[PDB]
Write a protein that binds this ligand. Structure first.
Ligand SMILES: Nc1ncnc2c1ncn2[C@@H]1O[C@H](COP(=O)(O)OP(=O)(O)OP(=O)(O)O)[C@@H](O)[C@H]1O
Ligand SMILES: Nc1ncnc2c1ncn2[C@@H]1O[C@H](COP(=O)(O)OP(=O)(O)OP(=O)(O)O)[C@@H](O)[C@H]1O
Lengths: 175, 180
């Protein structure tokens, strides 16, 4: 496990000090002309640059409305640890009993998403500004990480999303 | 250089006996909460927003304690592979001046005033505490900088100015020369 940090010190999964990429679900793809993008970015007056008719917006960190990132090159290598010390994040949604159901688990109406906590944490880690589509029972939904809502794409009703860890006690650690 | 990631995958300059470390920011340092296992237990219940730990009202929804930012460090540590410093990004901090141009923090305004604080000072604070509000002096005036709003505000006149953070430009030519 090797990580680098993006422009806001976020942990991410090179011959220049910088790597410019845009997120077209499912992948972060390299820009061509990385040195030219960087030169524009190093000028604080510049918010808009267009290369190949792709409109980059440094204020929103978007290109044609897709998220972009600047990876800093310096790499960090994970220290070998017991997996009991790794945080697992669980994702929940506010159900019709106004209680929390874990994603991939059955609702009070015996409906479940295919997506689960592992799926959502992986996506959230890679792309926090990600809006994504998913199915549950007979319905289609849109999940926004930024708003922490899911929305039925037909009825437009929103439900609240929450992200909290699996509890690991000091007893669990010794065990 | 060894780092941990917080609850939002942010790199933090640092393993610890628990898988989690709960801290609050008392300017200018991150301090350990007492009763970390009890905070974590409450946090792992998604219905819990508010707890009291001794004197402290902790708010998981805002990730604040008595209005100070809090963070949860994940314990897995990452050790930086030492490289040529030409591969490290240097961040410059600017403010929009009265000629509607950018002055670097610590450099002269069009009115011959300068902040004490500079790009190194701001990048260090921003890295440690992005939800930080900072007080600073420039000429005879007192200011507040909000990282979240990317604004400075004269605390007397309430005049706001826009803040921008962009790198020192390093070309592929610069890279080749910097390998002695
Ligand atoms: N992520 C999910 N996983 C499983 N079931 C879900 C999920 N989201 C919603 N549901 C189920 O869908 C129903 C909630 O409806 P939904 O959010 O699709 O909007 P709606 O049709 O406008 O409102 P409602 O279905 O309450 O009349 C409930 O049966 C709920 O349990
Ligand atoms: N970070 C800074 N570093 C140096 N000088 C600064 C800085 N911020 C503001 N100044 C200077 O302070 C002077 C007054 O601007 P300031 O933002 O303090 O608000 P102000 O007194 O309300 O100004 P005005 O009334 O002219 O709008 C200007 O010359 C400006 O260049």
């Amino acid at each position: 496990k090797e990580i680098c940090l993006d422009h806001l010190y976020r942990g991410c999964q090179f011959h220049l000090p910088y790597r410019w990429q845009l997120f077209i679900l499912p992948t972060w793809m390299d820009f061509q002309d990385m040195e030219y993008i960087e030169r524009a970015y190093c000028d604080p007056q510049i918010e808009i640059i267009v290369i190949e008719k792709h409109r980059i917006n440094f204020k929103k960190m978007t290109c044609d409305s897709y998220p972009i990132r600047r990876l800093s090159t310096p790499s960090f290598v994970e220290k070998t640890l017991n997996s009991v010390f790794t945080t697992k994040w669980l994702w929940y949604w506010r159900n019709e009993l106004n209680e929390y159901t874990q994603y991939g688990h059955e609702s009070p109406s015996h409906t479940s998403s295919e997506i689960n906590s592992a799926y959502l944490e992986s996506f959230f880690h890679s792309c926090p500004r990600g809006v994504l589509q998913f199915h549950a029972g007979s319905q289609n939904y849109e999940l926004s990480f930024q708003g922490m809502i899911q929305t039925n794409i037909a009825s437009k009703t929103q439900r609240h999303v929450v992200r909290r860890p699996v509890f690991v006690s000091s007893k669990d650690v010794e065990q």
